[PDB]
Swiss-Prot record:
Mg(2+) 3 binds at D423, E427. It catalyses: (2E,6E)-farnesyl diphosphate = (1S,8aR)-delta-cadinene + diphosphate. Its EC number is 4.2.3.13. Binds 3 Mg(2+) ions per subunit. Belongs to the terpene synthase family. Mg(2+) 2 binds at D279, D283. This is (+)-delta-cadinene synthase isozyme XC1. The Asp-Asp-Xaa-Xaa-Asp/Glu (DDXXD/E) motif is important for the catalytic activity, presumably through binding to Mg(2+). Keywords: Lyase, Magnesium, Metal-binding.
Length: 515
């Protein structure tokens, strides 16, 4: 076809490229540590402050300290009474962190009529926090179900009369919640709004420097991956293949940005790249008769299968077996090989579902509704990315972790729903369409369809939140992988490569922050 190329060209290829500032960093870090443990004027300020530490992208340094503060605040509360702001932010932060705070804390804010009290509509700061906090609602919490609409409405009505920076913060929240945003894309935006009165000087400085140090690190990782990709030469060799390596790395850097997951991003990014090439190969001038050997050789995964596939497919097969064979070397130094087979297996599952999707488009065979229902969720590859993301995490991950991920746990389901359903609407809205099928099956309209699909996304989100409420099926760092994948969707597939991918790639990878 028309091979490649990335819109980024060689911007990221070459390796990227002050000790005083590193010493600053080390020192600010301890200062910020101590302002988290030390008292503030009251519980609300301690809460606001932790919120900022989280929103500025640096809470990963202070996980235990922040946790201890939140436990105290949970076990030591006079619900009666905090404002709407104190109640909301406390409910949001505690729920994010797994504490079972009842939605009844919002009862107090209604009139006997059952409408939201009149006073409430005037408390913008309180509406913002309530707005944000209602993205933490799970099932059976109608008050927060009402809150989201109530607050959405009255906030758009107040944007006009607001003075910066509060204005910016509102307009932004109606576009992007704190909860479904990608921590790092949001961090870059809050760094700007936080700089604008009474903000903590040392927080804001540490977060600026930390942001650049990480950016440096990612810039190193992305250069190692691009050099890797450049040698594959999928340019001449695979005319029909897109080039989405940078966009992949961004997706994956959303699964985890932290320093400790550096090997993770590396392995994960190669995987998603090959997945892409595999996807495209099922979506090119491959005929079905070529796809069954291909899929067949993927199922058996052995270099000997390379002689059994059409010549044009050998380069993707060899690249593919090479990625995993490498994952095994990189992870051998702690005897974590056993993780790789699980990831192989998920790639294979994914390729089997591509085979079926392909037969449908190439043989134009209209599937019944539940034939379609059964085969659609596993074309997503979020099970594959979650599972594979574990390969390069630390000891928190365990053979049991892979036994749980393979069994389809509620948190991977929820993220799959979110993926499959946002990806469909987004395609129709802006061959084989879930919406197109829903329209035929129940005889409704695109809009009425969008209605039902989004209604499902929101319920999937409620399941997701719920999966963090203690006790949990798995450690938090295991669940965040799935949360973050759900966040990649909300950020990247809502109303190429898109102003969203381009916009985020620039702020996290190209433009540093002026100290
Ligand atoms: C996604 C980027 C880079 C920017 C955002 C722009 C938008 C809204 C893209 C929606 C199109 C898209 C990538 C898909 F439908 C994924 O289909 P894919 O072919 O990737 O997987 P299948 O589900 O069709 O097998
Ligand atoms: Mg595709
Ligand atoms: Mg496809
Ligand atoms: Mg698609």
């Amino acid at each position: 076809a028309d091979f490649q190329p990335s819109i980024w060209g060689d911007l990221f290829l070459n390796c990227p490229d002050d000790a005083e500032t590193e010493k600053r960093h080390q020192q600010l870090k301890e200062e910020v540590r101590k302002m988290i443990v030390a008292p503030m004027a009251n519980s609300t300020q301690k809460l606001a402050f932790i919120d900022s530490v989280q929103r500025l992208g640096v809470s990963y340094h202070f996980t235990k300290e922040i946790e201890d503060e939140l436990e105290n605040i949970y076990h030591n509360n006079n619900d009666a009474e905090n404002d709407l702001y104190t109640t909301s932010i406390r409910f949001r932060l505690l729920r994010e962190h797994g504490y079972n705070v009842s939605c009844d804390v919002f009862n107090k804010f209604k009139d006997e009529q059952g409408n939201f009290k009149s006073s409430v509509t005037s408390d913008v700061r309180g509406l913002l926090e309530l707005y944000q906090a209602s993205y933490l609602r799970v099932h059976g919490e109608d008050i927060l179900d009402e809150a989201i609409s109530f607050t959405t409405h009255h906030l758009s009505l107040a944007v006009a009369s607001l003075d910066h920076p509060l204005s910016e913060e509102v307009s932004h929240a109606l576009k992007q919640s704190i909860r479904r945003g990608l921590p790092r894309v949001e961090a870059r935006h809050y760094l700007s709004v936080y700089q604008d009165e009474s903000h903590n000087k040392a927080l804001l400085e540490f977060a600026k420097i930390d942001f650049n140090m990480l950016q440096f690190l990612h810039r190193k990782e992305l250069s190692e991956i691009c050099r890797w990709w450049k040698d594959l030469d999928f340019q001449r060799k695979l005319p029909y293949a897109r080039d989405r390596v940078v966009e992949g790395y961004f997706w994956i850097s959303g699964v985890y940005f932290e320093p400790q997951y550096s090997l993770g991003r590396k392995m994960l990014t190669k995987v998603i790249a090959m997945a892409s090439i595999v996807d495209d190969t099922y979506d090119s001038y491959a005929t079905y008769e070529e796809l069954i050997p291909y899929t067949n050789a993927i199922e058996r995964w052995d270099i000997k299968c390379i002689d059994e596939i059409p010549e044009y497919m050998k380069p993707s097969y060899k690249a593919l077996l090479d990625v995993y064979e490498e994952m095994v070397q990189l992870v051998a130094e702690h005897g974590r090989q056993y993780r790789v087979e699980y990831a192989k297996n998920a790639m294979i599952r994914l390729a089997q579902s591509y085979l079926v999707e392909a037969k449908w488009t190439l043989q134009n065979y209209k599937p019944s509704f539940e034939e379609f229902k059964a085969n659609a969720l596993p074309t997503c590859g979020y099970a594959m990315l979650a599972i594979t993301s574990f390969v390069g995490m630390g000891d928190i991950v365990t053979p049991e972790t892979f036994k749980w991920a393979a069994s389809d746990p509620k948190i991977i389901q929820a993220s799959t729903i979110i993926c499959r359903f946002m990806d469909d609407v987004a395609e129709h809205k802006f061959d084989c369409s879930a919406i197109e099928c829903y329209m035929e099956e129940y005889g409704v309209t695109a809009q009425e369809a969008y209605d039902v699909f989004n209604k499902h996304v929101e319920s999937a989100w409620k399941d997701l939140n719920q999966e963090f409420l203690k006790p949990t099926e798995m450690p938090t760092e295991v669940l965040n992988r799935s949360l973050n994948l759900a966040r990649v969707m909300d950020v990247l597939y809502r109303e190429y490569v898109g102003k969203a991918a381009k916009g985020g790639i620039t702020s996290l990878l190209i433009e540093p922050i002026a100290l």
